[PDB]
Structure 1
Amino acid sequence: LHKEPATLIKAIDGDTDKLMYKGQPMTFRLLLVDTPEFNEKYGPEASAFTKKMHENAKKIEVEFDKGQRTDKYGRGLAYIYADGKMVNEALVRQGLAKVAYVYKGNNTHEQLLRKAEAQAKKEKLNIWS
């Protein structure tokens, strides 16, 4: 897999953003994770966390997996990195997202995120509290 450039257009919520990619505005849905919706518990904390990670980033990058790059809603499916740090993993590691939506062929970083989830759970963090 490889990282490609993008620039923030807008934070949206825990697991979606709006980025400029190849010069076009797109909504991205983070691979392999599920944040609570804003109206749910930890939803606001998840949005804030993702927002901050995106907004404080000097450098945003997009990393597609091997499979479909867009979902049925037209959202890009990617791992997103803020200054080299994966947002998808960071959310899980903090217990602000669950590993979810693991579809065969876009699951390269499954075991990395599951390891983060086990640690967040051990620490009884947020969703696991």
Structure 2
Amino acid sequence: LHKEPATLIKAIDGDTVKLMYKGQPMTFRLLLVDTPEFNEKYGPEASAFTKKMVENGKKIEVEFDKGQRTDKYGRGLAYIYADGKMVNEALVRQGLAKVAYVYKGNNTHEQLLRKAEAQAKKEKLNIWS
């Protein structure tokens, strides 16, 4: 996989973010994770964690997997990085997202994220408390 440039347009919630990619605005949905909705428990905390990570990043990047690049709603499907740190992994490691939506052929980082989830769960963090 390859990281590509993007700039923040605006934070949305724990697992969606609006970015400018190849000069066009797009909503991205983070691969392999599920955060609570804003109206659910840990939803506000997941939203805040993603917002801080992407707003504080000097360099945002998009990494597509090998399969579908957009979903049925027209959202981009990617791994999102801020200053080299994966947002998708970071959410899971903090117990703010579950590993989820693992479709065959867009699952390169699955085992990395399941190892972060095991660690969050062992530490009883957030969703796992």
- For 1:59 and 1:109, the matched residues in 2 are separated by 21
Q: What is the root-mean-square deviation in Å for CA atoms of aligned residues?
A: 0.1
Structure 1 residue 87: Cα displacement: 0.1
In 2, Cα distance between equivalents of 1:84 and 1:72:
28
| Aligned-pair CA distance for 1:51 | 0.1
1:13-64 per-position Cα deviation (integer Å, ceiling 9, x unaligned) = 0000000000000000000000000000000000000000000000000000
Q: Distance in 2 between matches of 1:121 and 1:13?
A: 22
In the TM superposition, structure 1's runs of 4+ consecutive aligned residues that sit over 3 Å from their partners are none
Tell me the distance in 1 between the aligned counterparts of 2:74 and 2:49: 24
**SS across alignment from 1:54:** helix
How far apart, CA to CA, are the structure 1 residues paired with 2:115 and 2:67?
22
How far residue 98 of structure 1 moved from its aligned partner, in angstroms, is 0.1
Distance 2:100 2:49 in 1: 18
Could you tell me how far apart the structure 2 residues matched to 1:123 and 1:34 are?
A: 19
Q: Percent identity?
A: 98
- Residue 95 of structure 1 and its aligned partner are, at CA, apart by 0.1
* Separation (CA, whole Å) in 2 of partners of 1:57 and 1:68: 26
How far is the alpha carbon of 1:71 from its aligned partner?
A: 0.1
Unaligned segments of structure 2, at least 5 residues:
none
**1:10, CA displacement in angstroms?**
0.2
Please give the alpha-carbon distance, in whole angstroms, between the structure 2 residues aligned to 1:83 and 1:2.
15
TM-score after normalising by structure 2: 1.00
Give the aligned partner of residue 120 of structure 1: 120
Distance 2:54 2:62 in 1: 12
Q: CA separation in 1, counterparts of 2:69 and 2:102? A: 14
